[PDB]
From a paper:
Aromatic residues cluster in the core of folded proteins, where they stabilize the structure through multiple interactions. NMR studies in the 1970s demonstrated that aromatic side chains can undergo ring flips—that is, 180° rotations of the χ2 dihedral angle (Cβ–Cγ axis)—even when engaged in stabilizing interactions in the hydrophobic core. Here we capture ring flipping events of a buried tyrosine residue in the SH3 domain of the JNK-interacting protein 1 (JIP1). Our data therefore suggest that the conformation of the aromatic ring at position 526 is determined by steric interactions dictated by the size of the surrounding amino acids.
We therefore hypothesized that SH3 domains of group 1 have eclipsed conformations, whereas group 2 have staggered conformations. To test our hypothesis, we determined two crystal structures of SH3 domains of the scaffold protein POSH (‘plenty of SH3 domains’), for which the first SH3 domain belongs to group 2 and the fourth SH3 domain belongs to group 1. POSH-SH3-4 shows a similar structure to JIP1-SH3, with an eclipsed conformation of the corresponding phenylalanine residue (F867) stabilized by CH–π interactions from V858 (position 517), K861 (position 520) and G882 (position 541), and by π–π interactions with H834 (position 493).
Residue numbers in the entry: 826 to 888
The structure:
Amino acid sequence: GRRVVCERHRVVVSYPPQSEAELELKEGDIVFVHKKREDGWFKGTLQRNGKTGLFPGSFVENI
């Protein structure tokens, strides 16, 4: 019941970052979601490169 801050997701649609605040997503990447924002952007950390940043939530799916 305690907050989930490391929720495992898979990237469904690749996303190129518009700035350094954003994460590059590649299809198939594993991303751990720390926060889902009211504006629909997620904060998470990629397993592949260890980077933390913001990305559009609709581009990922729960595992």
